């Protein structure tokens, strides 16, 4: 997208959670018109994502720990984000 920026955040799980919610994915209703991507749709107050402070509602997730989130389902996105790691390098596209 014109004027878009690519941002990265390193977030550590606390009690098994990153403190954010996702929407979208291939095979789901699109969060943004015409974009089947995975998007940050909620950030829990006082959670790890809020504390680190880099990510924002509306960010499109491009990768997590170098796993591409382009062309993946909501279900696959969730599996990855619920995996056994505690450390997540999240790359997003902000528009």
């Amino acid at each position: 997208p014109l004027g878009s920026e690519v941002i990265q955040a390193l977030i550590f799980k606390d009690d098994g959670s990153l403190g954010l919610s996702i929407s979208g994915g291939v095979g789901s209703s699109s969060f943004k018109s015409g974009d089947d991507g995975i998007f940050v749709s909620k950030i829990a107050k006082g959670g790890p994502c809020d504390n680190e402070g880099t990510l924002k509602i509306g960010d499109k997730i491009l990768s997590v720990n170098e796993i591409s989130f382009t062309g993946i389902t909501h279900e696959k996105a969730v599996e990855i984000l619920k995996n056994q790691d505690s450390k997540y390098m999240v790359v997003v596209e902000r528009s």
Binding site: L20, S23, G25, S29, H74
Partner: peptide, 8 residues
């Protein structure tokens, strides 16, 4: 189409 929102 399904429109999930999942907390992680």
């Amino acid at each position: 189409n399904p429109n999930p929102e999942t907390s992680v």
